[PDB]
């Protein structure tokens, strides 16, 4: 969840944000209410504003359908999907503002370092709120220019490295890291960007490379939830999987973390208020994690029944 901007005055105003996960999309669906005003580009798009008269999930895709009477920018429908920007204008209740903070405290960005390199020259910067902030430079048979660059990247301390630049210097550098610095190389990626220095960092940001990194960090957390569920299944300790088991555990509000496959929600919402389960888990301090069957974590989850939970205590007894 990205919060592009807000101008709240006395808890009322506009908040412009971007959902980055199905979790986000799911929360926005209950945040946006009939009566509010939503701005989004639609269609040469045009970005309209509508006084929401209905909010609902699509049936055959992860999309939030928001419809109402055009107000700014007749009637129109805005379809919200992950990665799309939208502005919600209303009087905000503390619950929603809280959920938004949590959503944000869920999409934290790792310390990212960008390195543009070309024969005999390199410049690195770290990502900060205002943009890329240069951290060092290095200028040029035996090069060993690489070793010097690598040593200072290693001393700056970060988790992900974006390596860009003209030609193959960037490529050979990564190989250099794969051999001399395996731990740094495992979290480094080479992008097609040719620019260098300031120009380069700007292009990197334009290509949404960072957005992809975040995307991987999220999928990595889902796999970790699948591993915990598995270890729990192995130890036969504090876990439930399958709707029946989960409902049983929920009866005692033993759900710490509810894991659910997007396909599951779609199929179930047709038969019962599956979303009520999710609201109830959270209302009880539980966390909801919606995984997309488009990736591996959600596929595994489906294999186990499409829905599982990490418990606060056993309940089989």
Domain residue ranges in the chain: 1-109, 110-218, 219-317
Cα–Cα distance, 310 to 293 (Å, whole number): 19
Three-state SS at 191: coil
Q: Which one, of 103, 59, 85, lies nearest residue 288 by Cα?
A: 103
Three-state SS at 258: strand
128: tokens are 């900060």
Q: Which one, of 97, 129, 130, 108, lies nearest residue 21 by Cα?
A: 108
Contacts of 163 (CB under 8 A, 6+ apart): 115, 117, 170, 173, 174, 188, 189, 190, 191
Give the H/E segment covering residue 217: helix 209-235
Helical packing angle, 94-104 and 22-31, nearest 10°: 170
Q: Are 221 and 293 in contact (CB under 8 A)?
A: no
Domains 110-218 and 219-317 share a fold: no
Using the CB atoms, write b or e for 108-130: b if 16+ within 10 Å.
eeeebbbbbbbeebbbbbbbeee
- CATH second-level architecture of 110-218? 2-Layer Sandwich (3.30)
Dihedral sign (CA 53, 1, 294, 164): positive
Q: Are 142 and 190 in contact (CB under 8 A)?
A: no
How is residue 9 annotated by DSSP? B
Q: Which one, of 157, 174, 153, 178, lies nearest residue 165 by Cα?
A: 174
Cα–Cα distance, 265 to 284 (Å, whole number): 20
Determined by: X-ray
How is residue 166 annotated by DSSP? S
Cα–Cα distance, 116 to 123 (Å, whole number): 6
What radius of gyration, in Å, describes the C-alpha atoms of the chain? 23
Q: What are phi and psi of 251, to 5 degrees?
A: -60, -25
Task: State the resolution, in angstroms.
Answer: 2.9
Give the start-end residues of each E strand in 154-237: 160-164, 188-190
Half-sphere exposure of 157 (CA within 13 A, CB side): 0
Find the farthest-apart pair of alpha carbons in the chain and give their distance in angstroms, rounded.
Answer: 71
295: tokens are 């990736």
68: tokens are 């109402």
CATH topology of domain 1-109: SH3 type barrels. (2.30.30)
CA distance to 65, 83, 149, 164, 274, per residue, from 152 (Å): 49, 34, 5, 17, 52
CATH of domain 219-317: 3.30.1330.30
Q: Which one, of 59, 6, 56, 62, lies nearest residue 32 by Cα?
A: 56
């Amino acid at each position: 969840m990205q919060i592009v901007e807000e101008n709240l005055r006395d808890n009322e105003g506009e908040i412009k944000l971007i959902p980055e996960t199905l979790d986000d999309l799911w929360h926005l669906r209950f945040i946006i209410e009939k009566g509010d005003v939503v701005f989004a580009t639609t269609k040469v798009t045009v970005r309209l504003g509508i006084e929401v008269e209905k909010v609902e999930f699509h049936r055959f895709a992860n999309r939030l359908r928001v419809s109402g009477k055009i107000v700014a920018g007749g009637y129109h429908t805005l379809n919200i999907t992950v990665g799309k920007e939208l502005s919600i204008i209303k009087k905000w209740k503390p619950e929603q503002l809280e959920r938004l903070r949590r959503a944000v405290e869920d999409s934290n960005r790792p310390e990212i370092v960008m390195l543009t390199i070309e024969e005999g020259y390199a410049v690195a910067g770290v990502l900060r709120q205002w943009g890329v902030e240069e951290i060092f430079e290095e200028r040029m048979s035996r090069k060993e220019f690489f070793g010097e660059v690598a040593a200072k990247l290693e001393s700056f301390d970060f988790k992900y490295l974006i390596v860009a630049g003209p030609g193959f210097a960037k490529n050979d550098f990564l190989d250099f890291l794969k051999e001399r610095y395996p731990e740094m190389a495992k979290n480094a990626v080479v992008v097609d960007v040719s620019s260098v220095g300031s120009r380069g960092f700007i292009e990197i940001l334009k290509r949404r490379v960072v957005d992809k990194i975040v995307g991987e960090v999220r999928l990595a957390e889902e796999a970790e939830y699948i591993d915990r569920l598995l270890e729990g299944i192995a130890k036969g300790e504090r876990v439930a999987y399958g709707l029946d088991e989960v409902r049983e555990a929920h009866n005692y509000r033993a759900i710490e973390v509810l894991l659910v496959a997007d396909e599951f929600l779609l199929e179930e919402r047709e038969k019962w208020d599956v979303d009520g389960l999710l609201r109830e888990v959270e209302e009880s301090g539980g966390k909801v994690v919606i995984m997309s069957t488009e990736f591996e974590p959600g596929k595994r989850l489906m294999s186990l029944g499409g829905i599982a939970a990490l418990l606060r205590f056993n309940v089989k007894g």
